[model samples]
Target: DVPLPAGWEMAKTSSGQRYFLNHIDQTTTWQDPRKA
Candidate 1:
């Protein structure tokens, strides 16, 4: 496994699962968990 900072973790996106993290919200989410 790759190394990450103590508080960080890994995530894999689906073939077309677009994602983004909002600085203000401090969060990331897939546009669609099932669709490609």
Candidate 2:
């Protein structure tokens, strides 16, 4: 797993899969934003 970036936070699906939230842009992604 990658480190969370600024304005980004870790979350989980109802099934428990990891995901990310971007507070800066009010977005969410299954892919790591830092890697993008």
Candidate 3:
């Protein structure tokens, strides 16, 4: 498994996919579950 990047947090996704959230920026990044 990949480590969470700095300033990012794990977010719950609707489709069970991976989500990286930056709360300070109020943004999210989608990541492939297969890749993780």
Candidate 4:
């Protein structure tokens, strides 16, 4: 799976998925550029 973004609070991608606000971290830092 791919990462997200800081304060993303959601994971909206081309693949489509639910939001995981608490998971925000370096792993998700600028990870989902277009659909974070």
Candidate 5:
């Protein structure tokens, strides 16, 4: 798996898909911020 960006944390859904959490902004997204 790719490394998460600064302030970004990894999370998992019940269906097993990966998601990202931005602790700095307290936001969540399905897309990878590292790709941005």
Candidate 6:
């Protein structure tokens, strides 16, 4: 895979593809999933 260009990442992945990176806090919730 190509580098993140210093400080960027694949913000959005294709409909049916698996990518790497921290996908946390993508929605309004930003804490434990159990609490959401």
lDDT of 4 by residue, 1-36 (tens): 346445456655667654444454534343345564
- In model 4, the clashing pairs are none
Task: Give lDDT: candidate 3, residue 32.
Answer: 43
- Give the per-residue lDDT of model 6 (tens digit) for 2-35: 3232222343447764343434533332223323
Q: Highest lDDT, which number?
A: 5
**TM-scores of all predicted structures:** 0.28, 0.60, 0.45, 0.22, 0.62, 0.17
Runs of candidate 4 with Cα error greater than 4 angstroms are 1-8, 23-36
Query: Which consecutive 10 residues in model 6 have the weakest lDDT in total?
Result: 27-36
Off by over 4 Å in 3: 12-15, 31-36
In model 1, where do residues sit more than 4 Å from their true spots? 1-17, 32-36
Top TM-score prediction, candidate number: 5
The lDDT of model 5 is 0.79
Model 2: what TM-score? Answer: 0.60
Which 10 successive residues of model 5 have the least lDDT summed? Answer: 1-10
Kindly give the stretch of ten consecutive residues in candidate 3 with the minimal lDDT sum. 27-36
Residue 33, model 5: Cα distance from true site in angstroms:
1.0
Q: Tens digit of lDDT per residue, candidate 2, span 1-36?
A: 356587777787789799788887888878867677
How well is each residue in 1-36 modelled by candidate 3, as lDDT tens digits? Answer: 345566667877798776777767878768643355
Alpha-carbon runs more than 4 Å astray in model 2: 13-15
Write out the backbone clash pairs for model 2. none
TM-score of 6: 0.17
